[PDB]
Amino acid sequence: ASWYEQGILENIQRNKLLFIETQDGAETSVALEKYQEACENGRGAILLSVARGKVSEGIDFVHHYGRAVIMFGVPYVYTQSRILKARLEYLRDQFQIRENDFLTFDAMRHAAQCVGRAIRGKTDYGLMVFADKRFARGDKRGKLPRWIQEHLTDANLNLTVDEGVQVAKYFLRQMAQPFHREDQLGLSLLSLEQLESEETLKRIEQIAQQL
Amino acid sequence: RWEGGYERTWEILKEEHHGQVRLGMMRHLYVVVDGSRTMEDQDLKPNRLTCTLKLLEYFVEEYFDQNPISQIGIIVTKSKRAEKLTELSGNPRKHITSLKKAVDMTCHGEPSLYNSLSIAMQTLKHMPGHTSREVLIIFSSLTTCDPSNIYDLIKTLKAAKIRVSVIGLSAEVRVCTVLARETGGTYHVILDESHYKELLTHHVSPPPASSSSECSLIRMGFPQHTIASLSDQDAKPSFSMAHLDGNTEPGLTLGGYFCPQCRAKYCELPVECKICGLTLVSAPHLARSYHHLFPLDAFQEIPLEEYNGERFCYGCQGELKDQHVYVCAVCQNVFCVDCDVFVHDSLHCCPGCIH
Amino acid sequence: RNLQEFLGGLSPGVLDRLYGHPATCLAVFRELPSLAKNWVMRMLFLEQPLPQAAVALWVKKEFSKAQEESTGLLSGLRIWHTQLLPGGLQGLILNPIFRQNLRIALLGGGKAWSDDTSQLGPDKHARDVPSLDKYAEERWEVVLHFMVGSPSAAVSQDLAQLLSQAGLMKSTEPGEPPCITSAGFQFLLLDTPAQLWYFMLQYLQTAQSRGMDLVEILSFLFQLSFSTLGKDYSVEGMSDSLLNFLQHLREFGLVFQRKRKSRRYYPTRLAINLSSGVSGAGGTVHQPGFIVVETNYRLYAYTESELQIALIALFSEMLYRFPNMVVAQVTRESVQQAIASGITAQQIIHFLRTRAHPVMLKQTPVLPPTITDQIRLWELERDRLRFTEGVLYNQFLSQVDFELLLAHARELGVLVFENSAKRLMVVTPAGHSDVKRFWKRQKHSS
Amino acid sequence: ISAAFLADVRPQTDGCNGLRYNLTSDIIESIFRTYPAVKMKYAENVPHNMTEKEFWTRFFQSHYFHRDKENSNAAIIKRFNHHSAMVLAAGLRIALNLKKSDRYYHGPTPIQSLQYATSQDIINSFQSIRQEMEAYTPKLTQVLSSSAASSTITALSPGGALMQGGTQQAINQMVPNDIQSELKHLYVAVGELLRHFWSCFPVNTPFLEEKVVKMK
Amino acid sequence: DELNLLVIVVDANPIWWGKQALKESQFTLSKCIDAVMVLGNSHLFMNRSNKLAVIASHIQESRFLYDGKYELLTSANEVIVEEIKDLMTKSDIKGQHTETLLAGSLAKALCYIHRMNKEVKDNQEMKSRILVIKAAEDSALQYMNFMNVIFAAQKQNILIDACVLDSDSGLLQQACDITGGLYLKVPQMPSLLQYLLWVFLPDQDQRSQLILPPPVHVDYRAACFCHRNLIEIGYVCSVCLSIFCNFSPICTTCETAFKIS
Ligand SMILES: [Zn+2]
Ligand SMILES: [Zn+2]
Ligand SMILES: [Zn+2]
Ligand SMILES: [Zn+2]
Ligand SMILES: [Zn+2]
């Protein structure tokens, strides 16, 4: 509503079509279908959902569907629910787990669920944006999946809008270049002969870590 | 709470040819250029429009240099409409003039890929099957408006055997990628001005001929430069047919080129005769693409220290001081970096092989 | 004045004598225009005169003016000459001596000017090209310091006599160093090749004063022009006048010679480019710019030689003198003082552009345009008052008489200013007598 | 169809109370395609119930255009989704191995006058020059002569053999400009007629015979 | 900053010059060498920035040739005389190859020009032109290589001037027409030097103002590969661009059948 009143959302609609989900799943499915059709019709379609909505639960994105995923802040659960408070108290009294730590873990799990569905393989590349200064916190940042946290370069930590746009342009241009599956051989893809190499087996063993 | 202390005292301290396969001997290339608001962006200095059109002029010059028997058409998509900026012809001067005029255009609206593709297909509908139909599209904006379903147009183009290649500017488009893959063309993304020039140079070379490509024995004529002397009684000045098409009064030339099939007079070659449809070409024009028939294979690179032989280049007699030495496969000569680059790029022939 | 301008004003005999030197012919051909070069090459083996119409038909109609310029230059230099071709035609034929010497130089034959100085073998005290260049710089630095008047520069008296004859420095009081005039200041503000060229032109204009053969000196200079830098040549084979001129050049630093009795001499790059004058040497690798100009009209010099310090102080107020830095300020007072001394604004601007620091070279303008414009305005301030002495005629009773007298004055070329509306005019005092006599005679005829 | 037909198109305010609508038909058609309700209202009201300008003023003043709190946010979201859905709905409504490469060695160039010399004696002649220029000295006088120079000048002189032909005649002034324009028109007409004639050729159907006869 | 380069290629075919010597004509190989050396000396004489490159075109290979007279000119003449004598005295006919390696010499000259241009500083522009003298007969097998050299020269925009002595060559005419160079056959060989000075010596800017003989008319007829006869209109192959006078179902060169239904 504030975007519409300010008029900024009008230019956003001018650039790409806008689709916003509602509480009714019947019309939400139609909106998602329209978004997918627009994305397959060459016209920009933008989806605005919640981390607890149906989109984050059972919707999967193809490479051309998960190009850009932006999380607006850490999705902390509404604390006014006494059920949540009682559960936090019980966990603290039975597992010595602080309520703030559990809330941060749940919010980071929801964020990773929302963003982790934008990649479908090596040939799939997508953009991840976290528009919040709170993610810069070490405790909050450390609660990210290892395969995602490892690629989280510190040079991208707490950027601005223009810097984020420039980095997105660079990443898109670099990753939109033509690529061959033969290049993946020996580095990220293994053939039948590469499996028999003992050095490859040692590298595979070093890849995984147990905790 | 950073006001507690701040000092910089410590800062003050002392310190790519394919196989021997059939290619595009006959080409009918159409260029699609975006004219949306995104062309005003300054990704390429000074803006996308000026650099893009300068590189387009360079591409046209190189394409006419390497493909004398090809055709160039220019289509500009602006305000969700398609405009045939330049007629499909082989004249480089007209194309350069049109591009220079379009340099000072206005970039507004959104691109209309569907309309431009439909217009190109309509123009290329009447073209013979043996001639290759090639489409180049410049896509600045990432969104386009189509009055109808584009997939039906994609199927129609696939049935029409038309090659479509798209060189995007911002990022990869899934729809454009699918269209290029189905049409047999290649999709590329611009990294910078140098990358754009490299992509244009790569696209200058004819694409390999597919299985569906036809093989017909086309008939062509090669008229001489008939020049009439006013001293002789057989001097008949006549206006050129091509010059008649312009609003300016054609120049009454004493001689020129006359069509052997219908005595049509033209002052420019290689230009296909408009009357009988005969393609009036010249012997150098045909031989201008012979280098594609026999590409120059890359020479073996052996460093100077590991090469115990002549210290002077075989091509320029220069002393071999480079860290790398290029040796031919056939005659096993010695070529420096400059000579090897020039031969592979321009000469396409080895002097020792000629000997 | 370029080389050809001085050559074109020479007598026919001097030109004919110079034509006997193949090196002189080579230099003359090199100094000709491209069309003139083509014409000379065409006529190199032509033993018959060429009709003028046939020569004129070679060039385009549009390039006739350029063709006429080349023809006039060739005629003035006496490279060719006109002959009464049989049948009334006026053929054009090259100078036989000039043509023969050109053929000798190009096709071969004749005799070498230098007798292969390798006969003496390698030089025991041979120098290096950088050393020769530095010595050439040092000698001219000494000459300039002496012109300034610093006691550190002591030169021969006859060298100062040349300057006195040149008019750069006038010896108003004998015994004391001469005071350098405005012409001397203009000479100092010129670039070093320009200074050398002007000095040599002045020497040539008074060459007959020393009893030195002009033809021999010019031919020797031309031979030195094509000489190889870092290579010695034979002193022997030259007249005593030529030996004295060579010693003078050694005093100038253009020629290196360890001892006056030495049989070897090394020409320098300055002497090589001396014949070309100011042009030709477009790639002069001079000293790096040490002068930095700031928007507050402040100059910072990374120099220590007193010559540049004096040059800067000629038109600026010195502020600080560091061991490796000199800080001065550009002021209107100093600029006006320099202008009163005879210094023009363009000389200062060109000199500052020559000494432009590499940091300032990064800017698209070499110097701040505002500073240059301020200097130009200061220069224009001095000549606001225009003084022109003359005689005023203002008592014209008839317009016809005024028009007639004005026409007569313009015929005489003595008119200074005219005012037809008020029937007023100004004439030169020298031409006043003639106009007065004409006016009186007109009344007498009336 | 672009979604900017509403946001970018605004009531233009001039200097002194001027409502420069600039109601181009292109924008009206886009609105009708996106909003069939507007077309229905126009059909049921214009020009009987209300004028077109009055209808546009009502639309500007209605809540339909000025959509601008949970109910308001839901209404805005529904309007945007409906607009997007309507826009989407209306958007639809061979390896080569040559045999004889020597043809490229001697291409369109016809058979030349390549003549082979005599038998081994030629080698002896090859020896002669080899012995002739083995002891060679440069020469200067023998290069050119005055007679040869005069002959070369005469050949290069205007009107000579080398100076082929000369000046020509101004054909432009000989033919009047009106006659030139008439000739251009006749050339264009004849060229078009002959292009139509040759278009039928080659004649593969009986209809082409009649068409060519009519063209003749 | 105007650097004018005049590359001279000399047809050093021993057969033609030996035949000419047998004819006992007034003009010999010595006169040709003297004329070439004089022309190069004049080219270097007209300006310091001018540069000269001389390459000898011989059947065996292409040879890079380069007292009151100028030191540099004398040194250049001595080097040229030494190189030509070394080539000719060691030029032994071993094989039936009679046509001179014209294409290889042109390629080497182009490589030398490219190397010089790379070595040329950005402060100066190096204008380049090539003059070639034709004495023996033309080469047919070098046609494709000659055309490739022509295209590269036109791409680099280098003038190519041809000086025919005895046998005309339409290939040289086409090269001069395309590259913009000058083609002319010298009728009097002893006068040849003047033809070099009067016509070929001036640069293209100088040639513009000077009035020069009109260029020779050049035709572009084609030979029909089935019989190598000149034709006006021919059937061009869409696969290998082979030209045939009569319609054929299968091309002889590319071995591809013409699928015309
Ligand atoms: Zn025709
Ligand atoms: Zn090389
Ligand atoms: Zn090779
Ligand atoms: Zn074929
Ligand atoms: Zn045939």
Side-chain angles (χ1 to χ4, degrees), chain E:
Chain E
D1 299 330
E2 301 179 2
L3 315 177
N4 294 330
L5 175 63
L6 180 57
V7 180
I8 302 179
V9 180
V10 176
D11 185 12
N13 169 269
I15 295 176
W16 184 92
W17 289 104
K19 291 181 177 180
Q20 195 71 15
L22 293 186
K23 302 169 186 178
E24 300 179 0
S25 61
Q26 305 174 357
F27 191 89
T28 57
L29 180 60
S30 168
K31 291 185 172 179
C32 178
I33 296 301
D34 293 331
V36 170
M37 292 185 304
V38 167
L39 184 61
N41 294 328
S42 307
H43 168 58
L44 294 181
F45 206 98
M46 294 187 63
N47 185 16
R48 282 183 173 175
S49 67
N50 295 11
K51 295 301 179 180
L52 175 71
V54 183
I55 303 177
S57 181
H58 188 259
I59 307 176
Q60 294 179 333
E61 63 177 1
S62 300
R63 190 62 179 181
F64 298 90
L65 302 187
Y66 189 86
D67 304 358
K69 34 184 177 180
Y70 198 82
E71 172 63 27
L72 297 181
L73 299 182
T74 308
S75 304
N77 297 329
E78 294 176 329
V79 169
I80 289 178
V81 168
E82 175 184 0
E83 294 288 66
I84 184 58
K85 286 187 175 182
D86 178 76
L87 178 62
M88 294 303 300
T89 51
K90 298 179 178 179
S91 60
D92 307 7
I93 292 188
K94 301 177 181 180
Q96 298 182 357
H97 296 268
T98 62
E99 324 187 272
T100 318
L101 301 180
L102 180 61
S105 301
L106 296 181
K108 293 181 179 180
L110 291 183
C111 295
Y112 186 87
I113 292 179
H114 188 48
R115 191 201 72 184
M116 292 272 87
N117 200 332
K118 285 190 170 181
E119 285 168 289
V120 155
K121 307 174 183 178
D122 301 331
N123 308 21
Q124 303 169 345
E125 300 180 359
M126 192 186 195
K127 297 183 179 181
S128 301
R129 61 174 182 176
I130 300 181
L131 171 55
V132 182
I133 48 181
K134 186 61 171 301
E137 297 183 0
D138 48 358
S139 183
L141 298 181
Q142 299 176 4
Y143 164 76
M144 186 177 182
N145 303 119
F146 191 71
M147 296 303 299
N148 288 274
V149 170
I150 291 174
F151 301 143
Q154 187 180 18
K155 175 184 178 181
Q156 283 191 339
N157 190 19
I158 302 180
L159 301 178
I160 299 180
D161 298 328
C163 183
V164 171
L165 301 180
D166 192 10
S167 60
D168 294 323
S169 180
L171 301 181
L172 304 180
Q173 311 177 2
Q174 296 185 355
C176 293
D177 181 70
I178 293 179
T179 61
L182 303 181
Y183 179 90
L184 181 58
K185 177 181 182 179
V186 177
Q188 299 179 0
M189 300 180 180
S191 312
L192 159 68
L193 180 67
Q194 181 169 337
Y195 297 95
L196 309 178
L197 304 181
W198 205 93
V199 180
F200 294 146
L201 178 62
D203 300 328
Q204 80 296 338
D205 45 319
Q206 300 178 272
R207 294 173 186 178
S208 304
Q209 3 280 59
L210 295 174
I211 295 185
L212 305 181
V216 187
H217 175 270
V218 185
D219 64 327
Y220 296 92
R221 292 175 296 181
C224 188
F225 296 94
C226 77
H227 31 62
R228 302 177 186 178
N229 304 333
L230 53 94
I231 56 178
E232 303 177 1
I233 311 178
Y235 292 87
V236 182
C237 176
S238 60
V239 183
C240 69
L241 306 181
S242 56
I243 297 95
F244 298 99
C245 63
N246 299 328
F247 173 80
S248 177
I250 303 179
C251 188
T252 62
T253 301
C254 64
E255 296 180 343
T256 298
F258 296 99
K259 308 174 183 178
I260 300 180
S261 60

Side-chain angles (χ1 to χ4, degrees), chain B residues 296 299 314 327-333 335 349-354:
Chain B
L296 207 283
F299 294 161
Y314 179 81
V327 177
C328 176
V330 179
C331 44
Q332 294 82 30
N333 300 329
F335 300 105
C349 299
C350 194
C353 306
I354 302 178

Side-chain angles (χ1 to χ4, degrees), chain C residues 23-97:
Chain C
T24 300
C25 306
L26 149 65
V28 169
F29 181 87
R30 281 186 45 186
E31 295 294 75
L32 289 180
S34 301
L35 179 56
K37 291 177 179 177
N38 164 77
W39 286 349
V40 170
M41 294 312 301
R42 288 178 172 182
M43 303 182 59
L44 182 57
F45 295 91
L46 299 187
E47 312 299 328
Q48 306 296 332
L50 301 186
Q52 189 173 359
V55 177
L57 287 178
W58 300 337
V59 206
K60 268 184 169 178
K61 306 175 182 179
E62 49 176 356
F63 296 99
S64 60
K65 179 181 180 180
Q67 158 197 342
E68 290 178 0
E69 289 175 358
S70 301
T71 300
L73 183 54
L74 295 179
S75 182
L77 297 180
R78 289 175 43 86
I79 303 177
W80 58 3
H81 34 73
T82 308
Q83 166 269 355
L84 22 286
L85 202 152
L89 299 179
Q90 294 295 338
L92 302 179
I93 165 181
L94 295 184
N95 175 266
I97 302 180

Side-chain angles (χ1 to χ4, degrees), chain C residues 45-48, chain D residues 141 144-153, chain E residues 194:
Chain C
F45 295 91
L46 299 187
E47 312 299 328
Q48 306 296 332
Chain D
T141 305
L144 286 180
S145 60
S146 60
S147 57
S150 179
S151 180
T152 311
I153 290 182
Chain E
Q194 181 169 337

